[PDB]
Every structure is written in C-alpha cells, then in structure tokens.
UniProtKB/TrEMBL annotation:
GO MF, one annotated term: metal ion binding
Binding residues for Mg(2+) 21: 264
Residues that, per the record, bind Mg(2+) 11: 160
Species of origin: Mycobacterium tuberculosis (strain ATCC 25618 / H37Rv)
Keyword presence, Nucleotide-binding: yes
Binding residue positions for Mg(2+) 14: 242
Binding site for Mg(2+) 1: 1
Residue positions binding CTP: 59, 72, 116, 185, 201, 203, 234
Modification Phosphoserine, positions: 74
InterPro entries with a match to the protein in the record: AbiEii
Binding sites annotated in the UniProt record for Mg(2+) 7: 108-109
Protein name: Nucleotidyl transferase AbiEii/AbiGii toxin family protein
Length: 287
C-alpha cells in the first residue's frame, strides 16, 4: 500500500483484506491495531532521561511476543507504571488528543480496583479511539504500580500490523521482561481468593507455558529472584507455590486453548498444571 488510509472505512477495508491474507479473524486483528495504537501513546510517556514510564504486561505483551496466531486472545491492555496513576492518566490523555498517524484517543476516568496485596490499588479505564474524526475502537486499559524490580528493565517489542494497511510508522513498545511476567502470573494462578470470589485464572496456565517456551534455556536465576521478590512483596501464599486446579478450570482452560492447536501445549488442564508445576520446581533450583 502506497499511502495511509484516507478514512476509517478505508482502514476497516484495508484490515479485513490483510486479515484474510494472513489467515486470522478480522476482529482479532482489529483489536490488535488498537492495542498497538495505545501502546504508541504509552511509549511516548517518558521521564527526564527518556526511559519509558509504562511497561505493557499480561495478554497484550504475549501477543507482541509471539504474534496473533501463537498467543492467547485477550482484550485487556495491562501496564506497569513507574509514576502515580493520575499523572499517568493525564499524560495518556494528553498524548491522545495530540494523535498518532491519525489516531486520537479520549480516556475514561480511572477507578480504583480491589487488590489484596498492593499498597497502591491499580486503576482501570478505557480509551475510545478514532481515526480522522471517526470513532474506531474502545480498549480496556489497566495500570498498576511498580513491584520490586519489575520495571527496572524492559524489552522493546514491535508489530508490523499497521505497516501492512499503509501506516508505515515504526512501532516499538516497551514491555516487562519475561522473568517478572513468570513471577506475577505464577503468583496469580496459585492465588487463594477470599470466600466471595474464586480464582478463575486458568488462562494463566496457558501463558506460563508460552513464557517458559520463550525463555528457552537462558537462566532461571533471574526468574527465581523475580518470584522470590513478588511472592514476598505481596506477603500472601509463600514460594514455591503448588499449582492447584479448581473444579471449574477444565473448561476455562479448554477455552484458553482456542486457536492454539498448532502449538505444543498441554491439551488438558491437569497436564498443564503439572507442566507449570515442573516449571516452578525447575525455577527453584538455581545457583
Ligand atoms: Mg488470581
Ligand atoms: Mg514449555
Ligand atoms: Mg485438578
């Protein structure tokens, strides 16, 4: 494509053409662009030394690490911020009005969410995107505070999705490194929740398998330290944990596998909880 889309209808038609070309669902690709678009806003938030203020996290980070086909499909945009929330929101809302390649975003008010082990309760808000004056997509956003050394470093991942529909701007998203993604997700999947609510995070089992695959050999001492840091800082269940399965997880885990038949994952919730438990033990042996 020679030029960027002239309007929203063009972008929608340019995307559905690229979606069928790459063998993915249009809605999945459309949310990817929007997710990519907010990342660009978040990337422009910086401190006095040029280092980023936000680090994307969770499902959006694994999508950028393995692409659309090899990553679980989720809608949340998770971020860890090195500054306080209303300063983050003002900066995000400031970057939205300015724009990026014709994309403008207005954000909703941040709302504190119930969190058991964080002295600074993360916040949740949404960005209503538009492309040249026409509403394009709404992305749920989540921002949480720093934890030990989880924002000390960052990976810079990229995606070519917008380069396909004629928006050639270079995408570079700062991401939380995998050792801390393993620690946070390990602590979440083995979390015992107070009576009212139950831990439904069977999907984290799938991701921990993906993150283990991305780590390859490398060295698990960084991952072990991150787990030692996260489990202690939250001061709930200790380390190492036991990957317990709950009665309603078999179907939730099967839903988390949708679209990952080509991948070498455990196809059942038990074998997955066993693989993640082997991975936990493998982390705990480090020297
Ligand atoms: Mg949890
Ligand atoms: Mg593995
Ligand atoms: Mg079980």
């Amino acid at each position: 494509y020679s030029s960027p889309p002239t309007n929203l209808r063009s972008l929608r038609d340019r995307l559905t053409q690229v979606a069928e070309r790459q063998g993915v669902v249009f809605g999945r690709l459309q949310r990817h662009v929007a997710m990519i678009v907010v990342a660009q806003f978040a990337a422009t938030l910086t401190d006095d030394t040029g280092a980023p203020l936000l680090l994307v996290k969770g499902g959006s980070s694994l999508e950028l690490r393995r692409g659309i086909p090899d990553s679980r499909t989720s809608k949340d945009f998770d971020t860890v911020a090195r500054r306080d929330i209303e300063l983050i929101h003002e900066q995000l809302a400031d970057a939205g009005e300015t724009g990026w390649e014709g994309f403008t975003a207005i954000f909703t008010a941040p709302e504190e969410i119930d969190v058991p082990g964080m002295p600074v309760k993360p916040r949740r808000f949404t960005a209503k995107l538009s492309y040249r004056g026409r509403a394009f997509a709404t992305v749920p956003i989540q921002v949480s505070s720093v934890e030990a050394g989880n924002a000390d470093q960052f990976d810079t991942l990229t995606s070519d999705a917008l380069g396909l529909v004629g928006v050639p701007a270079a995408v570079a998203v700062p991401c939380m490194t995998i050792p801390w993604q393993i620690a946070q997700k390990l602590h979440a999947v083995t979390a015992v929740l107070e009576e009212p609510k139950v831990n439904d995070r069977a999907h984290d089992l799938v991701d921990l398998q993906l993150l283990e695959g991305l780590l390859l050999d490398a060295d698990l001492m960084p991952t072990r330290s991150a787990c030692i840091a996260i489990f202690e800082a939250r001061a709930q269940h200790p380390w190492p944990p036991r990957v317990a399965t709950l009665p309603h997880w078999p179907l939730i885990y099967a839903g988390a596998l949708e679209g990952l038949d080509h991948l070498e994952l455990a196809r059942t919730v038990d074998a997955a909880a066993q693989a993640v438990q082997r991975f936990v033990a493998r982390i705990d042996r480090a020297t």
